[PDB]
């Protein structure tokens, strides 16, 4: 999830997708690699 200025920080799976709900893009910013993003998103 994005607060006002959180996007300045480097992405982080725990902080953004597990401790918060994350969008497909936030997850992609964490993995960068498409297939990895798919693997994770499909099980999210």
Partner 1 sequence: DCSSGWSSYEGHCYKVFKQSKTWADAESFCTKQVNGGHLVSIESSGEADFVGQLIAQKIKSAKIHVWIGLRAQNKEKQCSIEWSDGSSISYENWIEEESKKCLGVHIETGFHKWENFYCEQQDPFVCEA
Partner 2 sequence: DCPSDWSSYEGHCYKPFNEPKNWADAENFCTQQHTGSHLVSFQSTEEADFVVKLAFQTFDYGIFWMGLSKIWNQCNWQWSNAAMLKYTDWAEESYCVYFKSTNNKWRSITCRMIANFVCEFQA
Considering only residues 5, 14, 34, 35, which one is a binding residue for partner 2 as defined by CB under 8 A?
5
Reduced to 3 states, what is the DSSP secondary structure of residue 24? Answer: helix
Helix (H) or strand (E) holding 39: helix 34-42
Query: Do the Cβ atoms of 44 and 36 come closer than 8 Å?
Result: no
Greatest CA separation for the chain: 29
Task: Restricting to residues 11-30, name those near Ca ion by CB under 5 A.
Answer: 11, 14, 16, 19-20, 25-26, 29
Complex with partner 2: residue 8 or 42, whichever CB lies closer = 8
* Residue 24 lies near partner 1 (rule: CB under 8 A): yes
Residues that bind partner 2 (CB under 8 A): 5, 7-8, 10, 32
């Amino acid at each position: 999830a994005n607060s006002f200025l959180e996007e300045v920080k480097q992405g982080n799976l725990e902080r953004e997708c597990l401790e918060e709900a994350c969008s497909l893009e936030e997850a992609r910013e964490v993995f960068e690699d498409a297939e990895q993003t798919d693997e994770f998103w499909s099980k999210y």
